[PDB]
Each structure stands twice: as C-alpha cells, then as structure tokens.
Amino acid sequence: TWQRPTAEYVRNYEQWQSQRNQLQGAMQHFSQRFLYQSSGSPGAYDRSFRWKYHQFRFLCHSNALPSHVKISVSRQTLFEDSFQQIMNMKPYDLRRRLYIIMRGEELDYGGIAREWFFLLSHEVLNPMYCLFEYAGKNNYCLQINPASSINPDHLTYFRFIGRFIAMALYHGKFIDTGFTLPFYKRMLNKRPTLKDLESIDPEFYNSIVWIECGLELYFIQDMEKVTTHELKEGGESIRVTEENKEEYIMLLTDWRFTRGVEEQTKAFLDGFNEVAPLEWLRYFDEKELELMLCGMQEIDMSDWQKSTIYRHYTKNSKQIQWFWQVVKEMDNEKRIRLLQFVTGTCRLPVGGFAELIGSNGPQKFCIDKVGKETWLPRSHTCFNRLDLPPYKSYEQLREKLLYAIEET
Numbered sequence: 444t445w446q447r448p449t450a451e452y453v454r455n456y457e458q459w460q461s462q463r464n465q466l467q468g469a470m471q472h473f474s475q476r477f478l479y480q481s482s483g484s485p486g487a488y489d490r491s492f493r494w495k496y497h498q499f500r501f502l503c504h505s506n507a508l509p510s511h512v513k514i515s516v517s518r519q520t521l522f523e524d525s526f527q528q529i530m531n532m533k534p535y536d537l538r539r540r541l542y543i544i545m546r547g548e549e550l551d552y553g554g555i556a557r558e559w560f561f562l563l564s565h566e567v568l569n570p571m572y573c574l575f576e577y578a579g580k581n582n583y584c585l586q587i588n589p590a591s592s593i594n595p596d597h598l599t600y601f602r603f604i605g606r607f608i609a610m611a612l613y614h615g616k617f618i619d620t621g622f623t624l625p626f627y628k629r630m631l632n633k634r635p636t637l638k639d640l641e642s643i644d645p646e647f648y649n650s651i652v653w654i655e656c657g658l659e660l661y662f663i664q665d666m667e668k669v670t671t672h673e674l675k676e677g678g679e680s681i682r683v684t685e686e687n688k689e690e691y692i693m694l695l696t697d698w699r700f701t702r703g704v705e706e707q708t709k710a711f712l713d714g715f716n717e718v719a720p721l722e723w724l725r726y727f728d729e730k731e732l733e734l735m736l737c738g739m740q741e742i743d744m745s746d747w748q749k750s751t752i753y754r755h756y757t758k759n760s761k762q763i764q765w766f767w768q769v770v771k772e773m774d775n776e777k778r779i780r781l782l783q784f785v786t787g788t789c790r791l792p793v794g795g796f797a798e799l800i801g802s803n804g805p806q807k808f809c810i811d812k813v814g815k816e817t818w819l820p821r822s823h824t825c826f827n828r829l830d831l832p833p834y835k836s837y838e839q840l841r842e843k844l845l846y847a848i849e850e851t
C-alpha cells in the first residue's frame with residue numbers, strides 16, 4: 444500500500460500492530476480522561492482554562508444544526524468507512540449530534556462515539572498511508588511525513604484528518620493521535636520558536652545554536668532522492684554572512700517546522716476550519732489546545748515522586764523538598780501544565796511515570812541543579828528534564844516555577 448517496503452517501514456509496521464493490541468487493552472485507561480462538567484454562557488472573563496473551555500463549548504452549541512447524523516462503519520474497516528462518509532457529508536452536518544453505527548453491534552451511543560474517536564485516532568497513524576512518521580526512537584515525536592506524496596491521495600486524507608480532529612473538539616471527545624505542541628502552535632497561528640526545535644530535533648537545535656570562522660553557507664536548505672529549496676527568492680545566490688544571520692536562523696527555524704509539509708498542513712487546516720473555524724480557538728495556548736483534544740488525567744503525585752530521578756540533587760536536597768511541596772499545593776490542572784512544560788505533553792503512558800519515554804527511549808522524569816538563582820527554571824523535553832536553579836527560598840522557587848509554567 445503506497446510506499447515500497449524499507450527496513451524501517453517494516454519496523455514501524457510492527458510497532459503499529461503491537462500498538463493495536465495494546466490499544467485494545469488501553470481503552471479502560473482512556474475512558475477516565477475528563478474535562479469539565481457542562482456549563483450555556485460561561486460567565487465573566489477570568490483568564491482561566493475553565494472559562495475558555497466553556498466559551499468554546501458555547502460557540503459549538505450555538506452554531507450547531509439540530510438533529511443528528513449517522514456515521515455507519517465496520518470495526519475492521521474503520522478508517523476507510525469513516526473517510527467516505529465524512530468526506531461525502533458537507534462540513535456543517537458534522538456539527539449535528541453524532542450517531543456512530545458500528546455494523547453488527549447493538550445502547551450507550553456516547554460510549555460508542557468515544558471508542559470510535561479513540562480507535563480512529565490510532566488508525567490514522569498506520570505506516571501504510573505514509574502520512575506520519577516519528578522523529579525519535581519508537582513512536583517519539585509524531586510529525587507529518589515530508590514524503591506523504593508517495594500516497595497520491597495524501598492531501599484528501601489530511602483534509603479528512605482535519606475534519607476528524609475538528610469533530611473531536613466540536614463534540615467534546617478525546618483523541619490520542621499524539622500531535623506535538625508545535626503542531627498545535629500551528630493550528631493557533633503562533634510561530635514555533637528555537638526552544639521548540641529542541642523538542643523535535645535536538646541536534647538540529649544544537650547546530651542552529653552554534654550558528655566567524657564558520658564554513659560556507661547559503662540562504663538555502665537541502666532537503667531529501669534530493670531537492671534543494673530556496674529559503675527566500677534566489678537564495679542559492681544569497682550567501683549567508685557569518686555575521687548577518689538572523690534572517691538565516693529565523694527563516695531556518697521556520698523552515699525546519701515547514702519543510703515538505705506545507706500542503707499537507709494547509710490541507711489539514713482547511714479540513715479543520717470547514718467544521719470548526721480556527722478562529723474559535725483564539726483564547727487557547729498550545730498546551731490548553733492539547734488538553735482540549737486529549738483530556739485531563741488525574742496526576743498521581745506518589746507515582747510521580749517514586750519514578751523521579753535526580754542529578755546533583757537527592758530527594759533530601761532542600762530545593763526538591765520545596766518542589767514537591769509546591770506540586771502538592773497545585774490543583775490537578777497546574778500539575779498537568781508542569782507535566783507539559785517538562786515532558787512536552789499532557790499524555791502519560793499506560794502504567795505511569797516509570798515508563799516515561801524521551802527521544803533516546805526509556806527516560807524518567809528528571810531534575811538537575813543547574814541555573815543561576817536569577818534564572819527561571821527551564822526544561823529539555825526530549826530528556827524529560829527540569830533544570831531547577833538552586834534557589835535560596837521556598838517563595839523564590841515557587842514564584843519562578845509557577846511563572847515558567849504558566850508562561851507562553
């Protein structure tokens with residue numbers, strides 16, 4: 444199906460199948476995700492996630508056509524069945540209440556849509572289709588495959604994936620595809636930063652940082668057969684001057700997050716926007732959007748504490764005592780946000796904090812002493828690591844930690 448089989452296609456195929464067995468189990472765990480209880484108005488603006496969710500919800504109700512639509516599918520042909528129906532419906536009818544009819548299976552229509560959204564959100568990752576790939580080891584750091592074109596229907600598929608994610612959000616259902624924060628940034632129209640490069644391509648991040656005694660470069664980029672690309676008009680001709688670089692770094696970073704995925708992302712965003720206008724997400728930051736789409740979980744504090752590792756610090760060290768106390772003080776939603784800051788996602792694997800994964804593989808939540816008291820804490824999400832300055836007080840740590848976290 445589409446791409447010929449590489450050695451690495453075979454590898455990714457098996458991971459996906461295993462994922463399907465695992466997913467079959469995993470639903471019980473997925474069903475205890477939650478957001479907020481219904482309300483229509485959300486009351487007076489208060490900067491909180493709660494208010495934003497309600498306001499959004501409200502927009503979805505208010506603009507909903509009445510009655511329902513039947514989406515008819517077979518369990519073994521979920522992707523293909525869903526695609527046809529959805530694509531042949533007219534986006535506004537997807538705003539009506541969803542009745543998902545699983546063929547041959549007979550009360551809990553909410554329960555069925557929930558499972559359908561979950562299943563389908565894994566089925567789209569199928570290495571056949573060639574839509575996505577992973578940057579790190581195993582299934583670390585999802586991204587659109589630059590070579591999605593190998594599948595000649597790929598843009599239509601991306602458009603459908605767009606409607607599907609808009610429907611999850613529009614009907615308040617959770618998906619589990621694994622999109623990254625920079626991908627959400629793009630749905631919000633925020634420009635991903637250099638910091639964000641570290642999340643997805645840490646070594647590329649290092650090179651950009653290093654970028655005066657340094658070799659020959661051109662406002663051009665080589666992307667892979669091969670084809671080089673302009674990076675602004677007639678860039679081949681335009682020498683990057685080892686002291687004239689911002690244009691290069693900026694455009695580079697921007698290009699790293701748009702290399703060979705421009706039409707695919709456009710197509711994804713038109714699909715989303717037909718169903719639920721992107722304008723409606725205006726209040727959300729990229730972590731809040733992830734939350735809307737994936738759902739909150741209860742963060743088990745003790746699981747967190749147990750499976751944390753330290754560097755130049757023990758559990759006894761004063762700064763870490765202060766850390767855990769502050770975390771305890773936090774409500775669940777602030778615990779999630781700290782989780783997103785340090786690991787780049789609000790999703791926790793099946794068993795909990797021992798299984799945590801980084802770029803390199805198994806990689807538990809880490810805290811090292813590294814800062815400058817005047818510096819705020821910082822993270823390296825590829826390594827699930829918090830750099831926590833050896834602060835000189837509880838209130839020093841608490842202010843800074845809270846600040847870095849709600850920062851955007």
Ligand code: NA
Pocket residue numbers: 785786787788800801802824825826827
């Ligand atoms: Na991570």
